[PDB]
């Protein structure tokens, strides 16, 4: 199937107590592989997967230099943005950046993206064509001027269609056992008395990778879309994800309900029956 690489950057200002906290993190699909924390004692881009650990010192030296440069530009960005919206010196502020590449099932470029936020709202986005910007703001248009003038869009599309996807592919092969292979969900159902008349049926999906999954409850075949509570898919800590879905049910009717599970790791969609 389709794969992706994405990098995420967060810088947050700290009025009084020194420089902004800069954190960077890189992902291939749902697996973290690098990190940088400007407050860590290493002051280095760090590995976070065994498969990137095999890269030599060239990689670690170089990446560190680029993430330090990312750190510095975002540090200045904080000052710039506080000016643009003429905000005070008090109060902490946040700049965020996300970019990366999607490859199709063929392993050839499919989509690229580069977005920026300020204090959690959209600021400026590189469009789809990779040649123009959505400056959905007022002050963002000041940033759009600088960037189409400096040919940032031109060299972004070169990164995105080029070295982004080429290194993704290197990552896909090096982490073959981790990134190209799936963990199928371990599924089960639990039952919880609510009252004498009502009860909760909960459908569990555990130790799955990737995170994309659908869990639905059906009654007599009909979907219970409205009445199903779904928690947010959550990480286990070991590279896998969890999710559950629940429905309140009248006592004595549990047998009419089935849980249905869709995930890449399953060769066909699962149908779990409460009472087979």
């Amino acid at each position: 199937g389709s794969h992706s690489m994405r990098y995420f950057f967060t810088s947050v200002s700290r009025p009084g107590r020194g420089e902004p906290r800069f954190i960077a993190v890189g992902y291939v699909d749902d697996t973290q592989f690098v990190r940088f924390d400007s407050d860590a004692a290493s002051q280095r881009m760090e590995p976070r997967a065994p498969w990137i650990e095999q890269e030599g010192p060239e990689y670690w030296d170089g990446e560190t230099r680029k993430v330090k440069a990312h750190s510095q530009t975002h540090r200045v960005d904080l000052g710039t943005l506080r000016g643009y919206y003429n905000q005070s010196e008090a109060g902490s502020h946040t700049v965020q950046r996300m970019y990366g590449c999607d490859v199709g099932s063929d392993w050839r470029f499919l989509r690229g993206y580069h977005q920026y936020a300020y204090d959690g709202k959209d600021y400026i986005a590189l469009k789809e064509d990779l040649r123009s910007w959505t400056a959905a703001d007022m002050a963002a248009q000041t940033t759009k001027h600088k960037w189409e003038a400096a040919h940032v869009a031109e060299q972004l599309r070169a990164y995105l269609e080029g070295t982004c996807v080429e290194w993704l592919r290197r990552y896909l092969e090096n982490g073959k056992e981790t990134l190209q292979r799936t963990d199928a969900p371990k599924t089960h159902m639990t039952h919880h008395a609510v009252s004498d008349h009502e009860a909760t049926l909960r459908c569990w999906a555990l130790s799955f990778y990737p995170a994309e999954i659908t869990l639905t409850w059906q009654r007599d075949g009909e979907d219970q879309t409205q009445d199903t509570e779904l928690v947010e898919t959550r990480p286990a800590g070991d590279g896998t994800f969890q999710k559950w879905a629940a429905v309140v049910v009248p006592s004595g009717q549990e047998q009419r309900y089935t849980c249905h599970v869709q995930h890449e790791g399953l060769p066909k969609p699962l149908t779990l029956r409460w009472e087979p």
Partner: peptide, 9 residues
């Protein structure tokens, strides 16, 4: 890998 270089806003 990261993109090089990066621009301020």
């Amino acid at each position: 890998i990261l993109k090089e270089p990066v621009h301020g806003v």
